[PDB]
Design an enzyme around this catalytic site. Sequence first.
Site, PDB file in Angstrom:
ATOM      1  N   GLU B 370      36.764  28.884  13.289  1.00  0.00           N
ATOM      2  CA  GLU B 370      37.746  27.831  13.597  1.00  0.00           C
ATOM      3  C   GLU B 370      39.035  28.169  12.863  1.00  0.00           C
ATOM      4  O   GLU B 370      40.137  27.962  13.415  1.00  0.00           O
ATOM      5  CB  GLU B 370      37.194  26.426  13.228  1.00  0.00           C
ATOM      6  N   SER B 574      64.622   9.520  39.278  1.00  0.00           N
ATOM      7  CA  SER B 574      63.898   8.232  39.305  1.00  0.00           C
ATOM      8  C   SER B 574      62.513   8.333  38.717  1.00  0.00           C
ATOM      9  O   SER B 574      61.757   9.250  39.065  1.00  0.00           O
ATOM     10  CB  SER B 574      63.731   7.729  40.726  1.00  0.00           C
ATOM     11  N   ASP B 610      29.193   8.651  36.922  1.00  0.00           N
ATOM     12  CA  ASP B 610      29.962   9.881  37.285  1.00  0.00           C
ATOM     13  C   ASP B 610      31.443   9.548  37.403  1.00  0.00           C
ATOM     14  O   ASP B 610      32.298  10.336  36.965  1.00  0.00           O
ATOM     15  CB  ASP B 610      29.394  10.485  38.568  1.00  0.00           C
ATOM     16  N   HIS B 633      45.727  19.209  30.635  1.00  0.00           N
ATOM     17  CA  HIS B 633      45.709  17.727  30.731  1.00  0.00           C
ATOM     18  C   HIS B 633      47.176  17.287  30.898  1.00  0.00           C
ATOM     19  O   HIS B 633      48.068  17.670  30.111  1.00  0.00           O
ATOM     20  CB  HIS B 633      45.141  17.161  29.419  1.00  0.00           C
TER      21      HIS B 633
END
Lengths: 694, 694
Positions: B370, B574, B610, B633
């Site tokens: 890590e 916009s 689900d 994401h």
Amino acid sequence: KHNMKAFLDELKAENIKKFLYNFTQIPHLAGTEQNFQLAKQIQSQWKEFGLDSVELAHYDVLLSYPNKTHPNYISIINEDGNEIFNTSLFEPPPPGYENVSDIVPPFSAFSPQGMPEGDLVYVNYARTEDFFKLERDMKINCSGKIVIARYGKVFRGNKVKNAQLAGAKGVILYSDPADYFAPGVKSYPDGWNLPGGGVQRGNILNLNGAGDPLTPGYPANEYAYRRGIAEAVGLPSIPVHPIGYYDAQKLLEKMGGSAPPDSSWRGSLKVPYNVGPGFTGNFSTQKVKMHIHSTNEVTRIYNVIGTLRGAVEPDRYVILGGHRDSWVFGGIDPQSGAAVVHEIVRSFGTLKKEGWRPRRTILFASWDAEEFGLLGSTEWAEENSRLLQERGVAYINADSSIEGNYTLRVDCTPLMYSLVHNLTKELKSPDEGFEGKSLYESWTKKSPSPEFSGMPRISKLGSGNDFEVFFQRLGIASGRARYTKNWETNKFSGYPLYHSVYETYELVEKFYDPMFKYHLTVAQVRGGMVFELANSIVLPFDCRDYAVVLRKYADKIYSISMKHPQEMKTYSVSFDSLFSAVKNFTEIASKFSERLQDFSNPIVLRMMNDQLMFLERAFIDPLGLPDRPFYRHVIYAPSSHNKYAGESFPGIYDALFDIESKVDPSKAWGEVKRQIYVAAFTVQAAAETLSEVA
Amino acid sequence: KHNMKAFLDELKAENIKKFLYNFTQIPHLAGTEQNFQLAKQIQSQWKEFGLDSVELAHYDVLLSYPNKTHPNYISIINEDGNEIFNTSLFEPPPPGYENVSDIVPPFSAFSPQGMPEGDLVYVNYARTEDFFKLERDMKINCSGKIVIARYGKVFRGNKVKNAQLAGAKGVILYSDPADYFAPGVKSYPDGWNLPGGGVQRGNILNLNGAGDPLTPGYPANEYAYRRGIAEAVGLPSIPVHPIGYYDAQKLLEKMGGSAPPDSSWRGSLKVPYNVGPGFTGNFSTQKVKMHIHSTNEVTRIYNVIGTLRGAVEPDRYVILGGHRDSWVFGGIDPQSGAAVVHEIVRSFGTLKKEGWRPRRTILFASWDAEEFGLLGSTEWAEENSRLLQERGVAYINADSSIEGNYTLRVDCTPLMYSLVHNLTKELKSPDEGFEGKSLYESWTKKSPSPEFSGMPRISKLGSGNDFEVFFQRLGIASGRARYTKNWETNKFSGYPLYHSVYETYELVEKFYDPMFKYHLTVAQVRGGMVFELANSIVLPFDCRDYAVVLRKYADKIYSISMKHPQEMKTYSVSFDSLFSAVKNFTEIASKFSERLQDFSNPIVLRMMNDQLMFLERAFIDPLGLPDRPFYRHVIYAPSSHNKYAGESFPGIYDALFDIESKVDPSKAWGEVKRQIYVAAFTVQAAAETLSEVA
Ligand SMILES: *[C@@H]1O[C@H](CO)[C@@H](O[C@@H]2O[C@H](CO)[C@@H](O[C@@H]3O[C@H](CO)[C@@H](O)[C@H](O[C@H]4O[C@H](CO)[C@@H](O)[C@H](O)[C@@H]4O)[C@@H]3O)[C@H](O)[C@H]2NC(C)=O)[C@H](O)[C@H]1NC(C)=O
Ligand SMILES: *[C@@H]1O[C@H](CO)[C@@H](O[C@@H]2O[C@H](CO)[C@@H](O[C@@H]3O[C@H](CO)[C@@H](O)[C@H](O[C@H]4O[C@H](CO)[C@@H](O)[C@H](O)[C@@H]4O)[C@@H]3O)[C@H](O)[C@H]2NC(C)=O)[C@H](O)[C@H]1NC(C)=O
Ligand SMILES: *[C@@H]1O[C@H](CO)[C@@H](O[C@@H]2O[C@H](CO)[C@@H](O[C@@H]3O[C@H](CO)[C@@H](O)[C@H](O)[C@@H]3O)[C@H](O)[C@H]2NC(C)=O)[C@H](O)[C@H]1NC(C)=O
Ligand SMILES: *[C@@H]1O[C@H](CO)[C@@H](O[C@@H]2O[C@H](CO)[C@@H](O[C@@H]3O[C@H](CO)[C@@H](O)[C@H](O)[C@@H]3O)[C@H](O)[C@H]2NC(C)=O)[C@H](O)[C@H]1NC(C)=O
Ligand SMILES: *[C@@H]1O[C@H](CO)[C@@H](O[C@@H]2O[C@H](CO)[C@@H](O)[C@H](O)[C@H]2NC(C)=O)[C@H](O)[C@H]1NC(C)=O
Ligand SMILES: *[C@@H]1O[C@H](CO)[C@@H](O[C@@H]2O[C@H](CO)[C@@H](O)[C@H](O)[C@H]2NC(C)=O)[C@H](O)[C@H]1NC(C)=O
Ligand SMILES: *[C@@H]1O[C@H](CO)[C@@H](O[C@@H]2O[C@H](CO)[C@@H](O)[C@H](O)[C@H]2NC(C)=O)[C@H](O)[C@H]1NC(C)=O
Ligand SMILES: *[C@@H]1O[C@H](CO)[C@@H](O[C@@H]2O[C@H](CO)[C@@H](O)[C@H](O)[C@H]2NC(C)=O)[C@H](O)[C@H]1NC(C)=O
Ligand SMILES: O=C(O)CC[C@H](NC(=O)N[C@@H](CSCc1ccc(F)cc1)C(=O)O)C(=O)O
Ligand SMILES: O=C(O)CC[C@H](NC(=O)N[C@@H](CSCc1ccc(F)cc1)C(=O)O)C(=O)O
Ligand SMILES: *[C@@H]1O[C@H](CO)[C@@H](O)[C@H](O)[C@H]1NC(C)=O
Ligand SMILES: *[C@@H]1O[C@H](CO)[C@@H](O)[C@H](O)[C@H]1NC(C)=O
Ligand SMILES: *[C@@H]1O[C@H](CO)[C@@H](O)[C@H](O)[C@H]1NC(C)=O
Ligand SMILES: *[C@@H]1O[C@H](CO)[C@@H](O)[C@H](O)[C@H]1NC(C)=O
Ligand SMILES: *[C@@H]1O[C@H](CO)[C@@H](O)[C@H](O)[C@H]1NC(C)=O
Ligand SMILES: *[C@@H]1O[C@H](CO)[C@@H](O)[C@H](O)[C@H]1NC(C)=O
Ligand SMILES: [Ca+2]
Ligand SMILES: [Ca+2]
Ligand SMILES: [Cl-]
Ligand SMILES: [Cl-]
Ligand SMILES: [Zn+2]
Ligand SMILES: [Zn+2]
Ligand SMILES: [Zn+2]
Ligand SMILES: [Zn+2]
């Protein structure tokens, strides 16, 4: 009883005939009012037939149309600039339609505007190997030339890309009788052959799966941000126009320069088929001049989407889709498929009105703008990709039901091979000579498998139709089936009247399928597939059939590499990881199959159904193939040389292709090795989805 | 009874203490034999504790280590090239460890080699705004300078990227007492403050989610194709080295040129904090010279993966993961988290031996490497991405359990807000003054929500820890919780002894948590979360909490744009589509919640489970964010200016950032509009996953 037999028996040839007539009286070009009216009609009828919901999904996409007051044509122009020969401004309309309006004249959709003048070069079918032969062997330079190419063998967009990269300044496509006039059959209206004034329309984009050129990745909805035209995907940079063989004869007869390199370059016209560049001595100063004035225009298109909700698994979707837009009347393409879909919806709706519902949800789609690059199916899939990703069981396409009357033609994922074999064994053959015999029996006899005795041929999926986004982008198990001809080398060229004004209801009713029995057989195959997919308790996929083909494709790609043994030695190019992965896939798939047969537990079942549904999904790489981000399936992609054909292990295939010509062999072989790693990894990862889950 | 109380009561502070001692006696640097031995120990103990299977998953990844016979250091060098001051070659080891071997000396992992000599420029925290101030306001040019920067505020890799783009030829990082010496507390061994010889290790990569620099997208397995070093992802191009404040004082005291622009640039050392470039008149000819000789080396790493198979939904995975590799002894980071995970596994295994199994499968992971860039978690997720994509319910991280002793700190997806509020209301507060009160009560009092009275603060997830691949690449609902300090502006800077040799078992046992009650509370929060996720019949996610935050983020990004009203007028910018999408999400999520409460049907339940599991997944865009393909994401990404911090609507945020400085405003605002479209589309698409399915 409400079982598959009930569904199949309700299907009627007479209804398919009535719908085909109804859909082919006027042109239904994408983006026109006539096609919107037909959309609204289908939406209304699907409601009446009994579907739970039927909606229009619309998008605003880039389309292309000739200028009605400034016609496209090609000339031979003399020394002083007099146009001494002009190609036709339209196809002579067939009997009884000579007063139909709004027939779009022949054009190459998405051609840019221009008026290039120059010397012709004849490039055969304008395939990669045709250009290799010209440039590498004959030392002919296409730079600044107008290229003339016969249609056939490969998708027309690949021809134009190849001409563009050769440095052509324009492309003329034409239909040669060698490819579009079957010996012994009469021209239309008296037979099914292409007349000399007939011309094949079609788009010439190279979208590589992107959908609307202006919105790659996202639906072309009301608030979409659109690329500017200069950054649009897939547009050709040189003018292109198609013509018939009467006109082609005039352009080719004067051709000089080099003779054709061999007989595979000669068509059936009474001309030498000289490659040129330019015309023989006497006419050496005449040139060819194109006049192209078509415009690209963002235009609204409409898909019809009908839903029959599943009784048990409503969140699992089995999709039957095909397009509704046609170039002109669409007598074969697409309305022979659309009429089949309409009768399938009718039959399912009849069962539904008697209280039946399928186990899973069935979605039916009438796509728009397929002819302009699969635009309607693709924008819809872009909009709904998360639902399809997580819920899509299978996609069955339904474009033209017939392109001949000889035997069945099926292309599908290996996961559906067993389903197709089983279903066809239960259907009656429509063939003369096979009365009382199964469709499986006639099909296997007429189209023997090249690998296996007593099995029929089933081909890989390529592209050039609406299954592309579902299969190659999203990894949803897909298939297609139609009746076809016995003309092997014409497999990707189209039936003679393909995309011509002559493709009419009368063509079909008189020459192809007067009794609508081939249509009915196709309705049984497509509808039967949808029925089993939507109703079988265990999904009707056999993973072991993927294991078999993976080994075949691995042997094939290894054999290609092994034409370069010195290089495989120098750069340590090993296929060991790929064969290891295929071996593991074979072993795990065998074990999964045992459990699937050996497992009252709905969780284990559905767990296993999810393993089956997500297996095609596992072959997707989210990073896509090199420079083709929307072709994400690692096992299958449309060939980089011919969109209609599928290629297996495409990433490795393209890395190997013409590798002996690469300037930096270290780099080129490094990329082969990279693609081997990606393929071995993806096959092993897909295998692991079939392992016990925990 | 086997319920959550049974699980929670089995957890013991005394066991956490024993494991922490056991894990912190020797260094466990990634890629060393000591860390492989600890992996094997954990694998053995997890088996004994009762897990169904425990395997090591290994990969060969790029790591970085100093040269043991050619030490890194920095000098002040005089006119003749005499090195008149040298920084330390190691941190003075703490009491009783002065004979421990294999303590890695302080270095910046992945620094290239070099010996740059030059004049210093002081750049405060080397943030984007610090470089703006230098270049734009003070007109100081960093090109060809060595930059010296204090640690704190932002991830060190962002500092190095910022220095590189300013044209620096090297970077010196140091710990200022302003940021690493709390007033009134003694230096280590006598308190928890950083001594002047202490130094913070850490990597300086900019991987943007890629994992192993040599294999982006694919696991670094046995047959992996590796990029060459020149094409590796994320490596810095200039030498970097960290030092303590005794050494920093020596480098900074001579600094000349401009004064600090203001007091926010002054640390606590007895120096002027002049920005320079270079030293004051008398020493104007002295320079600073770095000597960096570290090497990057492909090295094997080992993750431990334990499985507790679910009784009902074995194909649904709830993951508890944290790393095992440490820079030196890892007394807080990571072993305070690893000891917590070990005791959680022990407790779950105790229930299991009594016949219990969770409803869903629980996977436990001890990740490696890590500290070198999230390498072990990322390679594993790359290998298993298809299983995680289709089966991953949630990921709970478990790095350091404590960084203070004041109150709880939670960062998670909005989908887990309700779960966290509910669980904390049922746990006892460990805080003095709150005996007999809930953890929710103490936490809410000490860390009030900035939006809502009577609620605690819960922050967005950023990055800099092993949840990144699961959340930002794969879209699996993720969370983290630990005990923290009361030092707001030190939120991303680390506790004083962070990544130093002084982070020992004794640090924790004497100064942080002598009774191990804060550790126990953290074990209850992390373990409680895993228990509810793995055992609740309906997944414990509330989609309405996403709707609330989406509106907040939409207001925030609109407010940023509205600092440029003339430009929004000119380019017709916009936000209407985004607010429309958020409104629709709010409406659909309300309806879904009603159905979820109002629906004996396991199919409807699981259908709905689900829908809940795939909701985080729906925010993933397969095309990634601009130039950061592994941050997929659309709602959350690590800040482009600080990896530790999350940013909301990152695609729009980055399009707006510093936009007034862009040369082509038409282009820049066009990209803002593009990002608005992408965000509105993704929010609407995620909403539609919650609609009725058919
Ligand atoms: C097909 O499935 C099989 C499993 O049935 C799977 O086998 C695995 O193969 C890998 C790669 O060969 C094995 O990896 C080895 O793992 C051991 C530890 O278990 C390591 O010590 C080995 O490394 C040493 O040897 C290497 C080769 O000489 C050296 O390069 C290295 O430096 C080390 O000295 C090596 O990593 C793995 O153990 C098996 N797993 C099993 C048998 O369970 C195979 O990989 C699958 N195919 C694909 C394409 O995935
Ligand atoms: C939030 O959810 C709502 C549904 O509750 C959803 O509303 C949809 O909005 C779109 C875009 O505004 C509507 O699109 C219209 O569709 C009609 C046909 O139904 C078209 O005629 C309209 O086009 C005309 O008008 C346009 C605008 O002036 C012109 O630009 C155009 O040239 C045409 O003249 C337009 O396409 C759609 O009908 C509704 N659907 C409903 C109410 O069911 C909304 O889009 C959702 N928000 C997001 C961000 O998805
Ligand atoms: C296509 O049809 C074939 C022939 O019917 C199907 O294969 C058959 O499938 C059945 C159901 O799984 C198999 O029966 C099973 O046999 C084992 C005994 O070994 C038993 O344990 C099970 O309880 C069950 O009876 C049968 O063996 C199998 N026949 C074969 C493979 O030759 C096939 O599934 C069909 N394909 C589809 C539906 O996609
Ligand atoms: C956190 O805890 C709260 C408080 O217990 C949970 O909210 C509560 O959840 C229950 C179960 O859904 C709700 O009960 C339901 O009420 C309706 C009546 O309107 C009824 O139709 C259902 O049959 C059921 O009884 C309850 O209303 C609700 N309380 C609230 C929202 O204030 C919440 O679910 C927990 N969060 C989790 C578990 O993630
Ligand atoms: C194709 O069939 C459709 C449906 O039968 C015909 O449309 C109907 O026409 C009648 C007479 O105009 C109307 O009363 C109905 O409203 C129509 N129904 C629809 C559109 O759902 C249509 O006329 C046929 N087209 C051709 C060329 O025969
Ligand atoms: C091919 O078509 C062109 C274009 O219509 C014809 O050339 C035009 O003829 C008209 C009337 O004689 C002239 O006024 C125009 O100036 C010509 N236009 C151009 C662009 O040349 C041409 O006559 C036709 N050729 C044949 C053989 O029919
Ligand atoms: C940490 O605890 C482990 C497990 O109790 C210790 O490892 C065991 O040590 C004994 C004595 O050498 C052996 O008999 C066992 O085989 C070991 N078990 C394992 C590795 O599973 C280890 O000694 C402890 N480490 C420290 C520093 O105290
Ligand atoms: C800082 O360290 C350097 C490097 O070890 C020292 O300089 C060396 O001194 C030795 C022995 O006197 C010489 O033989 C080397 O040639 C020197 N090396 C270099 C690269 O300069 C230096 O003395 C140290 N400075 C201080 C103040 O301790
Ligand atoms: O834009 C595209 O990708 C295709 C659009 C349009 N598609 C199309 O006409 N498809 C026809 C192609 S005819 C050649 C062919 C190719 C594959 C096949 F199985 C059967 C026939 C079809 O699939 O029926 C076209 O080819 O011009
Ligand atoms: O390579 C990476 O992305 C991170 C590697 C390593 N990660 C790390 O030390 N993380 C520590 C960061 S300390 C600062 C911090 C950041 C966020 C937070 F919630 C709490 C503390 C942690 O999350 O506990 C590092 O920061 O050097
Ligand atoms: C069609 O014909 C002419 C060519 O300039 C002109 O009147 C009109 O602009 C054209 N229409 C277009 C370009 O759509
Ligand atoms: C082809 O022809 C053009 C003529 O201008 C030239 O630029 C190009 O280099 C030629 N290529 C070859 C291979 O002869
Ligand atoms: C239909 O089949 C007959 C018999 O083989 C054949 O002669 C005829 O050409 C076929 N029609 C078409 C369009 O292929
Ligand atoms: C470590 O020190 C010296 C520097 O050249 C040399 O003996 C050895 O190669 C170095 N080790 C490396 C580069 O890993
Ligand atoms: C910064 O300094 C270097 C000195 O060589 C120069 O190349 C660069 O253009 C300078 N930039 C500015 C903004 O002054
Ligand atoms: C623990 O809490 C006490 C009381 O607030 C505080 O004085 C001490 O500094 C804390 N320890 C740490 C390491 O924060
Ligand atoms: Ca699009
Ligand atoms: Ca990797
Ligand atoms: Cl088809
Ligand atoms: Cl954490
Ligand atoms: Zn078609
Ligand atoms: Zn077509
Ligand atoms: Zn850590
Ligand atoms: Zn750390």
